[PDB]
């Protein structure tokens, strides 16, 4: 901050800053630093694609750099960069140590060549190369490096068990334990254990080596491998330790030439090929998967076929699964699992090849129906097949009522009963055109293409509903709340039937819903609320009448819509069985069985009597509430039809679980700050109030006046509004040059401890970036500066408003054509590298996740469209939105969609002309 | 035609049919045969991506196949498939011959390992590896294969000129001439000379090696390289013989440690990086282009930047041509050719990145106008830029008559006069909306946005026409 | 080459007098070009066409049917045509000019340009070489399309 910017003293505080970011472990902070004015040599500038997804050109650049084997620096970074994306066979076959003799005696200052090579020789091992090479490296007189002695002793344990002496094996394993316990271990307070992973990875592998080095027979052996499968359960899905541990297992059971060691060998070759497919670097998947291809594993053949199908090679993928499945109709080879799976993958390759359509896959599809009935992700995959087919049939014209969608609904609700994977994404796949054919029933009386089909498919929904789990229905419950109109009446009867199911089973989670149910002023809700109350009290579980207490809370919360002033009213309903409207009522656990699909019950005990209303010209009576544990959670009233915010909330609360399912997002610990919102009546709803409600408007008004930045306070809108488009940029530059870049001066006051400050800056960048581009993906607009929400606990950012969507700044007056909301005064506070950092990586991983399953996101945003809010945002406009979600550029192709679309959003938000060409109610520098 | 279709007798008349299509040389006829019911083993079915544009997965599949180095078939096809898409550094660094000793004495029935390795050792050479490895392979008692003796004698000529004895070099070159004239050559009537290319490629390289092995001084040397540039004119643009001949040239002038041999080295590293960019396998472009990057060639930096721009890497492409051009305003480094070219490529990368639009490239665009006026594919490239810009402006509405398309026509008809490359594709680029503004003149009388502009741009077409070539 | 470039132009109505074959060297060409831009579909006797391909060509192309240097020629042809198609767009601007046609419009020429770029039938994920080659091949080999057209275009001839 305080220096000449272009100056000689910068470069050393660039280079030690990047070596302390090697210490910090944030590889993308390192990336932003190497890309932000660190541009000395070209061989200094080619260390960025190293981590920018293109490591192959970096690696063969470094191996032609260091190939003369004399320079220290280039050759050390050659072996290290060659290490860091797992070309380990090429490390061990590299003849920088192999020659007419062994390696270099009296291992020089570039001993880290060895110290990076011995570990690759461990995790891909044999007898002879490990043997002669560590017996070359024993010929050192001294062994000063810790890591070479570490990997030496684990290698000598490996050759000891090649010689089959497990007590000497444990001797060297315990020696390695001594080395790490005495020489490697750093403390707490300093390390998110990403930096510890290089230690605990190797020690996990070492102990896993150790106790089944200390195994006796095959019963013990299969037991050891079963609890190694438990280790592979508890590892999560982090690729480098995954790869490391099971490749070390692979090295050991190819060391051991026992025959069940060979079976374990083949299956672990298979499984590391599986994770290499999962993490999409399928050359190592091939070079591992070969050793189980040649040992006659047809499932390994099928997933060799799937890596070929994944990359570019539709043709022989089709052809080899063709010859394998249509050859395999011999002895069982289990038909319901193996043959069902390979014919399933065959059928969806005929989908995504799209050349030999339905009837050819209809025959083997009914073969799938015959050979398997206990495994339903077949049915989900053919459900998305028929999603594609109904979209193709509707793509030419509005011709409906095919048997294909009827059968699609039928097996799909059958599939609901079995595993529950895509159900919580794809309940719209039944109900959307189920209610569309209900709309056809009200539309047209030719069109007796519905009636008997409607009765039969409603009977399918009935037999789904009497057998279904209760908890899966709540995932579309607001659209189930959005079902009011007649002309079917049996969809109404069955949605009241699922209200009865979800009311009798789990009554606690539906209290606010069954009371917001009948709350309107154009109340046709009297029937659909009072009659379900009659039927629930007709059902035998009614010990307590908290229904009327919830009605009293609702009439109080709508009485306080106008209690103005410019509270200590009625209470003692708390304590009750009223479970709190915090998301710690409604969050859903991942399925890890028996289990329970909800949080534990957080009821109410106390009621706050003091008012804490703002002066926001409508004055929301927001309350401070003490829960069942005793903690304080702010619960707000809200006005003016807060339903679309619940809709965006439901999109966000499927988005975050998709972020959890992403093993790249929450690998970097992604995720959004989020709250709870419900609609209760018209112009009356509920809100959660976040810990540390603050915004950039309020607290930057305080910060610029703490620096006493005196300005044209409420006359800048006059002297910019009377100003035309010519001086708009002029007065904008005048403003933003008067106002200094500050926000780090507020962050350092927020966080004394730079632990909290820097992890809050990471949380800040990520939690701002994700919500920020997802908003403009939704077409949000009008992001006034009261809408940034920032906790002072950890800096997590969220947009909360969502009260305007789908071009409400452009085709609305005061034309507000927006890139998206970004403040230029965020950029210094994000770091030295401006916005060019973990912001950008979060953007990359966010887009990579969102364009994996966007058709489920399309099913979610179908619920949005529903323009009681909007004038002419149409179904085709939703398809245009879907095109934008896919990657359809502004009438352009060549869609990179990750780095290109990230650069698109970044370098459209940094366009200062767009920053000037919008209204200073959205003053951008705040 | 006349058989049972599903029958046992088909498979042998599949496999000899595919070996006679190896004889026929039509690699895609081979491809159709291997993809049309030749589906025995998976290791028989993974020889199709070999020629179906994905050779890398095929190659590391074959090198993990043959890595145990005992089977004849898998290891021979390992080295051959590894050869057939030019991983020659990996061939020569492959330790199927390198060990604690040299290679296998009494070269067995898989001597085609050697016979495919010595040629890669030729076209990427040094002193010591060529030296000790062909002096390993001399220790055979008999040398029954023709091709191993061919590549042996061209390698011994290379070590003879490492020892700097050109008469003994020509002795072995003429020995290699004797080998091909006595043992390789087939006739006419039977060969579209694609099949002869494996012979005439090597002999072209061998003679090009030969007469400037028989060179005396630098005047003779630059003359030899100038008529080698004539050879590179008459080669056409067939990638494998291109690569082979100039990489052999590269091997020889890195053998010769003379300083103009090093200048010739650097520029031939540059040019094979150029053809590797042209044929789009830019890992070999990088691994060649390095040896002239480290010898301070900024045009090689710029086209390293263009292989990075080509692949996936807009960002540092922009950034390194940014730092190089906006650093290069020193002594001339010719402004009208080199600096004009690098700023031109900078400007169209700002086009195809599309983030820092017109005015930022308008300033350096007029800088291009200042520094160069004799070279017009700048003007064609900014003509297609304004094609994109007029399409973008018309993409929102039918608003015409901008000064940008007027100037576009103006320099574009100026560009017509100079080189005539995109003219015969893009005469519509002037006349289409020239006659559209004529249609605006008949359409609408607001729309006095045409008249004086129409007269001025018609005067531009007039001064194009009095100076233009007729044809 | 001529076969897929015709349907790229949207040719249609390839009656069997239009194949031209020299007995000197077997070079093929379509010559007619007297009908373009959906003159089989929105014209009576609806003639929705993949493009002209005769199934009796496939044995004569070789043992491998149509799956060969046909396919490689298709790959290299598409790889060339989607390098400089904006110059090809400048050429086909001259076509539009519908004194011949009723309502083939400028926006219809942009739709044609989208087809030339690789815009699928309302789909993305455009491989545009092996995928589009397989698209043309496995739409021409669809026997239902071979039956669903008029036998004045008798397809087996
Ligand atoms: N659900 C929420 N969670 C946390 N903070 C919120 C929430 N809703 C609003 N706020 C905060 O409340 C502050 C006061 O504004 P608020 O009364 O909530 O709306 P408002 O000021 O009336 N917007 P407007 O209707 O345009 O005047 C805002 O600056 C937000 O930071
Ligand atoms: N330009 C040409 N070059 C070579 N052969 C041609 C050419 N034009 C037509 N033919 C051939 O002439 C043959 C006789 O038909 P032709 O008289 O040319 O048109 P046509 O039979 O009248 N078509 P139509 O108008 O529908 O009856 C055709 O089968 C073509 O093979």
* Inter-residue contact B215 to B223 (CB < 8 Å): no
B61 touches chain A (CB under 8 A): yes
**Do C51 and C4 contact (CB within 8 A), yes or no?**
yes
Interchain contact B314–A (C-beta under 8 A): yes
* Angle at alpha carbon of residue C67, lines to C65 and C70, rounded to 5°: 105
The answer to whether the beta carbons of residues A110 and A75 sit under 8 Å apart is: yes
- Which numbered ligand comes closest to the C-alpha of C34? 2
- Residue A776 has which token pair? 């403009």
User: What contacts A697, CB < 8 A, 6 or more positions away?
Assistant: A784, A785, A786, A788, A926
C118 sits in the region (left: phi over 0; alpha: psi -120 to 50; else beta) called left
| B52: chain C residues, CB-CB within 8 Å | 130
For tokens 């083993």, what's the residue? B41
Calpha distance B249→A8 (Å, rounded): 44
The residue numbers preceding gaps of C to N over 2.5 A in chain B are 445
- Contact (CB<8Å) A42/B101: no
User: In which region does residue A618 sit, left (phi positive, over 0), alpha (psi from -120 to 50) or beta (all else)?
Assistant: alpha
Q: Does B49 touch chain C (CB under 8 A)?
A: no
- In this structure, the strands spanning A677-681 and A632-638 are unpaired
Dihedral, A374, A378, A383, A384 alpha carbons, nearest 10: 150
SS3 for chain B is CCCCCCCHHHCHHHHHHHHHHHHHCCHHHHHHHHHCCCCCCHHHHCCCCCCCCCHHHHHHHHHHHHHHCCCHHHHHHHHHHHHCCCCHHHHHHCCCCCCCCCCCCCCCCCCHHHHHHHHHHHHCCCCHHHHHHHHHHCCCCCCCCHHHHHHHHHHHHHHHHHCCCHHHHHHHHHHHHHHHHHHCCCCCCCCCCCCCHHHHHHHHHHHHHHHHHCCCCHHHHHHHHHHHHHHHHHCCCCHHHHHHHHHHHHHHHHHCCCHHHHHHHHHHHHHHHHHHHHCCCCCHHHHHHHHHHCCCCHHHHHHHHHHHHHHCCHHHHHHHHHHHHHHCCCCCCCHHHHHHHHHHHHHHHHHHHCCCCCHHHHHHHHHHHHHCCCCCHHHHHHHHHHHHHHHHHHCCCCCCCCHHHHHHHHHHHHHHCCCCCCHHHHHHHHHHHHHHHHHHHHHCCCCCCCHHHHHHHHHHHHHHHHHCCCC
B371 CB burial (10 A radius; 0-12, 13-18, 19+): middle
Phi (first) and psi of residue C28, to 5 degrees: -105, 145
| Smallest Cα distance from C92 to chain B, Å | 10
> How many Cβ atoms from other residues are within 10 Å of residue B12's Cβ?
9
CB A29 within 8 A of CB A840: no
Which residues of chain C make contact with A895, given a CB cutoff of 8 A?
A: 124
Given an 8 Å threshold on Cβ–Cβ distance, is A888 in contact with C124?
yes
* Among candidates C69, C87, C90 on the partner chain, residue whose Cβ is nearest the Cβ of B28: C69
* Spatial distance between the Cα atoms of B250 and B228, rounded to a whole number of angstroms: 12
Residue A705 exposed, middle or buried by CB count within 10 Å (0-12, 13-18, 19+) = exposed
Nearest-Cα distance to chain B for C135, in Å, is 17
For A232-389, list the strands marked E by DSSP.
none
Q: Under DSSP, is residue A527 helix (H, G, I), strand (E, B) or coil?
A: helix
Q: Are strands A788-790 and A684-689 parallel, antiparallel or unpaired?
A: unpaired
Spatial distance between the Cα atoms of A342 and A308, rounded to a whole number of angstroms: 15
Residue having the nearest C-alpha atom to atom 28 of ligand 1: A786
Q: Chain C: residue nearest B384 by CA?
A: C86
Q: How far apart are CA A491 and CA A458, in angstroms?
A: 7
- Which of A693, A782, A787, A926 maximizes ligand 1 atoms within 8 Å of its Cβ, making it the mutation to test the pocket? A693
Centre a 10 Å sphere on the Cβ of residue A744 and count the other Cβ atoms it contains. 17
Ligand number nearest to the C-alpha of C14 = 2
d(Cα A550, Cα A704) in Å, to the nearest integer? 45
Q: Where are the beta strands (DSSP E) in A8-73?
A: none
Residue B277's nearest CA partner among B233, B227, B254, B243 is: B243
With a 6 Å cutoff on the Cβ, whether C21 touches ligand 2 is: no
Query: Could you give the 3-state DSSP secondary structure of residue A697?
Result: helix
- SS3 assignment, position A382: helix
Peptide bond into A575 cis (omega under 30): yes
Residues B295, B314 contacting (CB under 8 angstroms): no
Shortest CA distance to B100 belongs to which of A129, A101, A136?
A101
Atom of ligand 1 nearest to the CA of A687: 1
- Hey, what are B451's tokens? 């008249």
Helix%, strand%, coil% for chain C, nearest 5: 45, 5, 55
Instruction: Give Cα A230 to chain centroid, integer Å.
Output: 24
Task: Determine contact: B253 vs chain C, CB below 8 A.
Answer: no
Considering CB atoms only, which of C119, C134, C139 is closest to A314?
C134
Closest residue of chain B to A894, computed from CA coordinates: B352
Question: Taking a contact as any Cβ pair under 8 Å apart, which residues of chain B between 413 and 432 contact chain C?
Answer: 422, 425-426, 428-429, 432
Residues preceding gaps in chain A (C to N > 2.5 Å)? 445, 566, 593
Q: Which residue has the tokens 């040389």?
A: B25
**What residue has token string 């494998």?**
B240
SS3 A357: coil
Q: From CA B209, how far away is CA B205, in angstroms rounded?
A: 6
Which residues of chain C lie closer than 8 angstroms to A312, CB-CB? 127, 130
Pairing state between β C28-30 and C19-21: antiparallel
Residue C22 beta carbon below 6 angstroms from any ligand 2 atom = no
Look at B60 and A286 and tell me if their CB atoms are within 8 Å.
yes
Kindly determine whether residue C117 and residue A314, on different chains, have CB atoms separated by under 8 Å.
Answer: no
A715 at the C interface (CB within 8 A)? no
Identify the helix (H) or strand (E) that includes residue A473.
none
- Extract the tokens encoding B338: 């080199």
Q: Where are the alpha helices (DSSP H) in A798-911?
A: 827-830, 838-850, 854-862, 875-886, 899-909
Q: Whose CA is nearest to atom 26 of ligand 1?
A: A616
Owner of token pair 């887009």: A847
* B48:A100 CB<8 A: no
Q: How far is CA B198 from CA A551, B203, B212, B217, B245, in A?
A: 91, 9, 22, 32, 12
- Residue of C72, C106, C131 to mutate when probing chain B, most B C-beta within 10 A: C72
Whether A693 is in the pocket of ligand 1, judged by its Cβ within 6 Å, is: yes
Which tokens belong to C70?
């046909």
Q: Which candidate, A244, A242, A262, A245, places its Cα nearest to that of A254?
A: A262
Q: Which helix (H) or strand (E) holds A466?
A: helix A451-467
Could you tell me the domains of chain C? 1-145 (1.10.1070.11)
Q: C131 with C30: CB under 8 angstroms?
A: no
Partner residue opposite A290 with nearest CB, options B65, B314, B395 = B65
Residue A314 has its nearest CB partner, among C122, C126, C131, at: C131
Optimal mutation site among C60, C78, C89, C90, interface B, most CBs of chain B within 10 A: C90
Name the residue at shortest CA distance from atom 19 of ligand 1: A616
Method used to solve the structure: cryo-EM
Q: Provide CB contacts within 8 A for B296, sequence distance 6+.
A: none
Contact call for residues B160 and B153 (beta carbons, < 8 A): no
C68 touches chain B (CB under 8 A): yes
> Encoding tokens for residue A283?
């050359």
Give me the DSSP letters along A155-221.
Answer: HHHHHHHHTT-HHHHHHHHHHHHHHHHHHT---SSS--TTTTHHHHHHHHHHHHHHHHHT--SHHHH
Residue in A49, A289, A290 to test binding to B, most B beta-carbons within 10 Å = A290
Is B384 in the C-facing interface, judged by CB distances under 8 Å?
yes
Q: Is C152 on the interface with A (CB under 8 A)?
A: no
* Residue whose C-alpha is closest to residue A799's, from A777, A823, A776, A768: A768
Say if ligand 1 is within 6 A of residue A687 CB.
yes
Distance of CA A804 to the CA centre of its chain: 25
């Amino acid at each position: 901050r305080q220096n000449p910017h272009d100056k000689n003293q910068n470069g050393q505080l660039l280079k030690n800053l990047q070596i302390t970011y090697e210490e910090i472990g944030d590889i993308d902070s390192l990336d932003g630093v190497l890309r932000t004015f660190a541009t000395g040599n070209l061989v200094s500038k080619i260390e960025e694609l190293q981590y920018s997804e293109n490591w192959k050109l970096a690696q063969d650049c470094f191996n032609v750099l260091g190939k003369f084997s004399d320079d220290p620096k280039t050759t050390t970074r050659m072996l290290k960069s060659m290490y860091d994306h797992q070309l380990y066979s090429q490390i061990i076959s590299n003849s920088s140590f192999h020659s007419s003799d062994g390696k270099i005696s009296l291992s020089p200052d570039v001993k880290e060549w060895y110290s990076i090579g011995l570990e690759a020789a461990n995790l891909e091992g044999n007898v002879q190369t490990l043997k002669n090479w560590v017996e070359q490296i024993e010929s050192l007189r001294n062994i000063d490096d810790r890591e070479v002695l570490l990997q030496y002793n684990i290698a000598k344990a490996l050759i000891a068990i090649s010689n089959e002496d497990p007590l000497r094996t444990q001797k060297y394993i315990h020696n390695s334990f001594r080395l790490i316990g005495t020489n490697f271990i750093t403390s707490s307070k300093e390390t998110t254990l990403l930096k510890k992973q290089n230690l605990l990875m190797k020690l996990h592998s070492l102990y896993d080596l150790s106790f089944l080095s200390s195994a006796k027979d095959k019963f013990e052996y299969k037991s050891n491998t079963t609890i190694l499968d438990y280790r592979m359960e508890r590892i999560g899905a982090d690729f480098v330790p995954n790869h490391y541990i099971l490749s070390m297992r692979k090295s050991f059971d190819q060391l051991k030439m026992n025959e069940q060691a060979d079976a374990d060998l083949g299956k672990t070759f298979f499984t590391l090929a599986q994770l290499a497919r999962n993490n999409a670097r399928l050359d190592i998947a091939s070079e591992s998967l070969m050793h189980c291809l040649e040992r006659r594993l047809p499932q390994a053949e099928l997933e060799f076929a799937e890596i070929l199908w994944k990359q570019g090679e539709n043709d022989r993928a089709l052809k080899i699964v063709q010859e394998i499945h249509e050859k395999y109709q011999e002895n069982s080879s289990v038909n319901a699992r193996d043959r069902a799976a390979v014919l399933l993958k065959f059928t969806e390759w005929l989908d995504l090849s799209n050349n030999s359509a339905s009837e050819q896959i209809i025959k083997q599809y009914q073969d799938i129906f015959q050979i398997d009935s206990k495994w339903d992700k077949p049915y989900y995959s053919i459900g998305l097949y028929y999603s594609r087919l109904l979209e193709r049939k509707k793509a030419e014209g509005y011709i409906t009522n095919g048997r294909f969608e009827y059968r699609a609904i039928s097996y799909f609700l059958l599939a609901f009963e079995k595993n529950t994977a895509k159900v919580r994404e794809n309940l719209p796949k039944v109900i959307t055109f189920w209610l569309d054919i209900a709309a056809a029933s009200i539309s047209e009386a030719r069109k007796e293409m519905l009636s008997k089909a409607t009765e039969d498919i409603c009977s399918h929904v009935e037999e789904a509903l009497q057998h279904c789990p209760t908890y899966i229905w709540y995932f579309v419950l607001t659209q189930l709340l959005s079902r009011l109109l007649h002309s079917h009446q049996s969809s109404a009867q069955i949605i009241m039937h699922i209200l009865l199911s979800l009311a009798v089973e789990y009554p606690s989670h539906i209290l606010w819903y069954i009371t917001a149910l009948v709350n309107s002023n154009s109340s046709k809700r009297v029937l659909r609320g009072k009659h379900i109350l009659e039927k629930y009290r007709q059902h035998s579980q009614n010990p307590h009448d908290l229904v009327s207490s919830a009605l009293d809370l609702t009439k109080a919360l709508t009485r306080v819509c106008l209690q103005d002033v410019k509270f200590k009213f009625d209470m003692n309903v708390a304590p009750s069985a009223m479970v709190v409207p915090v998301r710690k009522n409604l969050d859903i656990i991942s399925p890890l069985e028996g289990y329970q699909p909800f949080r534990p019950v957080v009821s109410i005990i106390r009621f706050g009597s003091s008012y804490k209303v703002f002066s926001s010209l409508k004055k929301p009576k927001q309350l401070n509430i003490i829960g069942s544990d005793g903690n304080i959670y702010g619960i707000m009233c809200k006005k003016e039809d807060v339903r679309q915010d619940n809709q965006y909330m439901q999109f966000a609360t499927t988005m975050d679980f998709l972020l959890s399912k992403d093993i790249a997002s929450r690998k970097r610990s992604l995720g959004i700050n989020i709250y709870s919102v419900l609609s209760l009546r018209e112009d009356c709803g509920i809100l959660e109030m976040v810990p540390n409600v603050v915004t950039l408007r309020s607290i930057l008004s305080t910060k610029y006046e703490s620096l006493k930045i005196k300005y044209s306070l409420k006359s800048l809108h006059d002297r910019w509004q009377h100003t035309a488009v010519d001086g708009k940029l002029e007065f904008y530059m005048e403003q933003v040059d008067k106002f200094p870049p500050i926000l780090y001066q507020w962050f350092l006051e927020n966080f004394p401890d730079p632990i909290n400050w820097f992890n809050a800056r990471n949380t800040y960048a990520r939690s701002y970036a994700v919500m920020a581009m997802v908003g403009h993906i939704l077409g949000l607009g009008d992001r006034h500066c009261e809408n940034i929400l920032l906790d002072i606990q950890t800096g997590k950012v969220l947009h909360v408003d969502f009260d305007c969507l789908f071009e409400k700044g452009k085709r609305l007056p005061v034309p507000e054509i927006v890139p998206f909301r970004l403040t230029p005064n965020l950029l210094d506070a994000l770091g030295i590298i401006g916005t060019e950092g973990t912001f950008k990586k979060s953007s990359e991983v966010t887009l990579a996740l969102m364009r994996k399953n966007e058709v489920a996101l399309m099913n979610v945003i179908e619920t949005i469209m529903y323009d009681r809010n909007m004038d002419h945002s149409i179904q085709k406009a939703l398809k245009v939105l879907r095109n934008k979600i896919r990657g359809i550029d502004p009438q352009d192709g060549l869609v990179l969609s990750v780095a290109g679309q990230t650069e698109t959003l970044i370098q459209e938000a940094t366009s200062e002309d767009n920053l000037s060409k919008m209204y200073i109610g959205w003053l951008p520098f705040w």
